Every structure is written in structure tokens, then in C-alpha cells.
């Protein structure tokens, strides 16, 4: 055949792959964590968005830290041979490097490690996308007017910069997930995924600002944070 290029991930396996959505809304009283109003709006938006991208979506609600780890361990031990990619969306409270189960924290690295190139062989060489709506600290943005690496082929789409709070609207859903679904809906059949996420960055950065009766939390801004260890371009569509 003619000249070939391989700059983009193969996304025409029989299945796009799993989209695991962990939606933690209600937390055990003893943790002292507030209920995350608006997160069901996020979970429903994501389910529909990834459904239309032909992901096999699994929604899970209010999982303990133990249930989160067991779920991700079990998913990582499935046969993904016929799947193009893997997507996991985490909706919860968080801190830098951490997301909360309903009863306590989970290290993000513990979750993602299950899918390392050497630990989930049927996903080796395939894009593994972790989408994280959770705080990464308490900073507020005031704004201004042979082998491959085991850590290769991961993408972490963080809702916010390192060290910063992340914003969720109780009526509309989180700024980041709102924006992400909107840009996927509009551009998944047109743009490469980094360029989609870049539009998400701009949407969140320009179109949202917090409103609070509390001066400390009022008029604040947010920028999401794309972390890519991908080795190829990612298009959700394929040719034929």
C-alpha cells in the first residue's frame, strides 16, 4: 500500500472503551465533608456526552474509598483488547494528589497505577484518560482584568491548577465539567483532544467567576490543568 503515518492513536477497535464515572455526592457524617450539590448535573452530562462518543458508560454513586480502589482494580483486570481507550471521571472532594471516597481519601496515584503499561497489558499503548473534578488545595485565583514507559499514554484532565480550589455550581454543575461536555459535544468530531481541552481551558477561564456573600470567596477565577503523557494525537472519530 501507499505511504503510511502513525501520529494518532488507533481509535477504530470494535469498542471505544469504558467510561467509568465516579460521582461522590454524599459523604459520611464523620468525615465532615459537605454534600456536593450540582454533581448529579455533572454526572448526567458526562454520561450523555460520552454515550454519544460511543463509550460504554458506567456510573457509580457514593463509593467508599475501599469501593473506589476495588472498582478500579477490577476494571483494570478486565480484558480491554477490543477497546480503543479507557476513560475514568472522578467527581468528588479532593486535595493535591487525592480524591475522596465517601469515608476518606484515596491517592490518585493508587487509582491510576492499576492501569500502568506493565500492569494492564490490554491497555498498553492505548490512551488512558483521567478526568478530575476535585479541589487540589485551597488557593483562590483572584484573576486580573523495545519497551515503553509504564507512565506513558496517560492524560490527566484536571479541573484546576495545582494547589487551587475547584468551583462547582449547585444549580449548573461544575465549571470544568460543564465546559468539558460542551466542548466535546461541539468539537469531538472535528478537533484533536488537546485542542478540545484547550478550548475548555479558555471557556472556564473567561466565562466563569464566583459570586459569594463572603469576600474571601467572591470574584474568583479558575484555570483547568491539562497534564499529558500521551505519545500520539487523540481523535474520538476515525476514518471509514
Amino acid at each position: 500500500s501507499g505511504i503510511s503515518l502513525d501520529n494518532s492513536y488507533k481509535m477504530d477497535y470494535p469498542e471505544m472503551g469504558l467510561c467509568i464515572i465516579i460521582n461522590n455526592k454524599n459523604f459520611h457524617k464523620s468525615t465532615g465533608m459537605t454534600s456536593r450539590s450540582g454533581t448529579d448535573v455533572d454526572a448526567a452530562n458526562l454520561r450523555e456526552t460520552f454515550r454519544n462518543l460511543k463509550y460504554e458508560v458506567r456510573n457509580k454513586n457514593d463509593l467508599t474509598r475501599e469501593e473506589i480502589v476495588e472498582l478500579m482494580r477490577d476494571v483494570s483486570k478486565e480484558d480491554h483488547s477490543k477497546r480503543s481507550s479507557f476513560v475514568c471521571v472522578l467527581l468528588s472532594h479532593g486535595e493535591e494528589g487525592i480524591i475522596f471516597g465517601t469515608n476518606g481519601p484515596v491517592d490518585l496515584a493508587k487509582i491510576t497505577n492499576f492501569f500502568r503499561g506493565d500492569r494492564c497489558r490490554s491497555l498498553t499503548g492505548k490512551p488512558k484518560l483521567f478526568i478530575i473534578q476535585a479541589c487540589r488545595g485551597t488557593e483562590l485565583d483572584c484573576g486580573i482584568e523495545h519497551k515503553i514507559p509504564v507512565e506513558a499514554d496517560f492524560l490527566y484532565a484536571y479541573s484546576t491548577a495545582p494547589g487551587y480550589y475547584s468551583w462547582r455550581n449547585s444549580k449548573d454543575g461544575s465549571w470544568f465539567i460543564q465546559s468539558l461536555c460542551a466542548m466535546l459535544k461541539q468539537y469531538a468530531d472535528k478537533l484533536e483532544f488537546m485542542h478540545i481541552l484547550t478550548r475548555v481551558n479558555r471557556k472556564v477561564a473567561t466565562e466563569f467567576e464566583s459570586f459569594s456573600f463572603d469576600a474571601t470567596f467572591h470574584a474568583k477565577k479558575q484555570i483547568p490543568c491539562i497534564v499529558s503523557m500521551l505519545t500520539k494525537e487523540l481523535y474520538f472519530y476515525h476514518h471509514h
Binding site: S37, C135, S166, S174, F217
Partner: peptide, 4 residues
């Protein structure tokens, strides 16, 4: 608006 609330923080996570």
C-alpha cells in the same frame, strides 16, 4: 458557587 461552592468549592470541592
Amino acid at each position: 458557587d461552592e468549592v470541592d
